[PDB]
């Protein structure tokens, strides 16, 4: 049997709402450890360790534009950090250090018998999520720290866009209409440049950039399948390789790709 598994089997009803099955708390990081700000979010109930994901956002943007996922996947059985940078003009390279640090602070937090998150976390298990340039610091994070179990980065930019040396699982959110970092030159072919590893690339019709954000009007869908990704990569978890590796079959996705998944 798996260890890691963690929650009631999930339906799409289940990963479509609002909230998963475990009650959610969260603090700020008292001393940020590399980084800027962190609120950590966790389940009071999982009823077993579960992995840390870090999550930071885009270039002039705070921790508001990505808070959302703070709950939406601390619900379902992870330990969520989300970050305000050391600067909010900070590039990809320096986002995914601090992101990292992040992740690192966690770790510590969880061998820390003060904080509400000592003994919660399976620090052998981690992922790296973000907006935009944080979405680019992610595929940083993962081409440089291959034992990550999953990345889920949304509209991503970056320097490159050749991330050929990535084997950490990864779901590329794209928002078809983005102005800022274009899915044609940067979302398509980052996705385009990994052929080693378990992808996924999710456009959604008509988004701006700030389509997969806090306030956000697909949090069913994306949420949807934030949660899966993060739950059959980071858990090994089985129960959720449809939910992962498919076709969403939605209304509010405009392209959509996958390879190697299932």
């Known amino acids: 049997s798996n260890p890691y598994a963690r929650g009631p089997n999930p339906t799409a009803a289940s990963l479509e709402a609002s909230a998963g099955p475990f009650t959610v708390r969260s603090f700020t990081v008292s001393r940020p450890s590399g980084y800027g700000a962190g609120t950590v979010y966790y389940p009071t109930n999982a009823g077993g360790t579960v992995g840390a994901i870090a999550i930071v956002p885009g270039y002039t943007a705070r921790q508001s534009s990505i808070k959302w996922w703070g709950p939406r996947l601390a619900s379902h059985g992870f330990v969520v950090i989300t970050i305000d940078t050391n600067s909010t003009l900070d590039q990809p390279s320096s986002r995914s250090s601090q992101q990292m640090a992040a992740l690192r602070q966690v770790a510590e937090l969880n061998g820390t018998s003060s904080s509400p998150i000592y003994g919660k976390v399976d620090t052998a298990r981690m992922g790296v999520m973000g907006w935009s ?130």
């Open 133 to 262: 340039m944080g979405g680019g610091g992610s595929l940083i994070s993962a081409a440089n720290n291959p034992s990550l179990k999953a990345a889920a980065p949304q509209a991503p930019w970056a320097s490159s866009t050749n991330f050929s040396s990535v084997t950490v699982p990864t779901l590329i959110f794209a928002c078809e209409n983005d102005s800022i970092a274009p899915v044609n030159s940067s979302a398509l072919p980052i996705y385009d440049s990994m052929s080693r590893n378990a992808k996924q690339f999710l456009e959604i019709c008509g988004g701006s950039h700030s389509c997969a954000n806090s306030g956000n009007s697909n949090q069913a869908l994306i949420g949807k399948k934030g949660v899966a990704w993060m739950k059959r990569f980071m858990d090994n978890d089985t129960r959720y390789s449809t939910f992962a590796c498919e076709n969403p079959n939605s209304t509010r996705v405009c392209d959509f790709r996958t390879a190697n998944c299932s």
